[PDB]
Amino acid sequence: EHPEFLKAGKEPGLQIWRVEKFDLVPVPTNLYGDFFTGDAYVILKTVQLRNGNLQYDLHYWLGNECSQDESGAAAIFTVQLDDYLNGRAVQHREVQGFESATFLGYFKSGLKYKKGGVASGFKHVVPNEVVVQ
């Protein structure tokens, strides 16, 4: 499909992404800054080291209301990125209620925690019209 987190790498700084729709989904403005407990967020940091090999680090965050199934899919994509960057990157997955200074240090503005997505805005794309039978 369109894996941006795994294919991420076009700017030395920080990129935030979120899993949604059985694929990778970015977090538009206004939305960024709020972590969800019913989903997984994948973040990849990129900097320019002396040699200029562009350092690549990534943190895998999961929600407490996401059994190993949802957390498994998120960790799965994170594990692949590692094999691709099993050179010396910084891979570290964080959980809700157990974050670390790295996270609290990456965002000190005060990350908001949203819970319960009261919204039935979601439809399944059907295969063209039912003309076929």
UniProtKB/Swiss-Prot annotation:
<feature type="repeat" description="Gelsolin-like 1">
    <location>
        <begin position="22"/>
        <end position="104"/>
    </location>
</feature>
<comment type="function">
    <text>Calcium-regulated, actin-modulating protein that binds to the plus (or barbed) ends of actin monomers or filaments, preventing monomer exchange (end-blocking or capping). It can promote the assembly of monomers into filaments (nucleation) as well as sever filaments already formed. Plays a role in ciliogenesis.</text>
</comment>
<feature type="binding site">
    <location>
        <position position="89"/>
    </location>
    <ligand>
        <name>Ca(2+) 2</name>
    </ligand>
</feature>
<feature type="binding site">
    <location>
        <position position="87"/>
    </location>
    <ligand>
        <name>Ca(2+) 2</name>
    </ligand>
</feature>
<comment type="subunit">
    <text>Binds to actin and to fibronectin. Identified in a complex composed of ACTA1, COBL, GSN and TMSB4X. Interacts with the inactive form of EIF2AK2/PKR. Interacts with FLII.</text>
</comment>
<feature type="binding site">
    <location>
        <begin position="108"/>
        <end position="115"/>
    </location>
    <ligand>
        <name>a 1,2-diacyl-sn-glycero-3-phospho-(1D-myo-inositol-4,5-bisphosphate)</name>
    </ligand>
</feature>
<feature type="binding site">
    <location>
        <position position="39"/>
    </location>
    <ligand>
        <name>Ca(2+) 1</name>
    </ligand>
</feature>
<feature type="binding site">
    <location>
        <position position="118"/>
    </location>
    <ligand>
        <name>Ca(2+) 1</name>
    </ligand>
</feature>
<feature type="region of interest" description="Actin-severing">
    <location>
        <begin position="1"/>
        <end position="122"/>
    </location>
</feature>
<feature type="binding site">
    <location>
        <position position="82"/>
    </location>
    <ligand>
        <name>Ca(2+) 2</name>
    </ligand>
</feature>
<feature type="modified residue" description="Phosphotyrosine; by SRC; in vitro">
    <location>
        <position position="32"/>
    </location>
</feature>
<comment type="similarity">
    <text>Belongs to the villin/gelsolin family.</text>
</comment>
<protein>
    <recommendedName>
        <fullName>Gelsolin</fullName>
    </recommendedName>
</protein>
<feature type="region of interest" description="Actin-actin interfilament contact point">
    <location>
        <begin position="69"/>
        <end position="72"/>
    </location>
</feature>
<feature type="binding site">
    <location>
        <position position="70"/>
    </location>
    <ligand>
        <name>Ca(2+) 1</name>
    </ligand>
</feature>
<feature type="binding site">
    <location>
        <position position="38"/>
    </location>
    <ligand>
        <name>Ca(2+) 1</name>
    </ligand>
</feature>
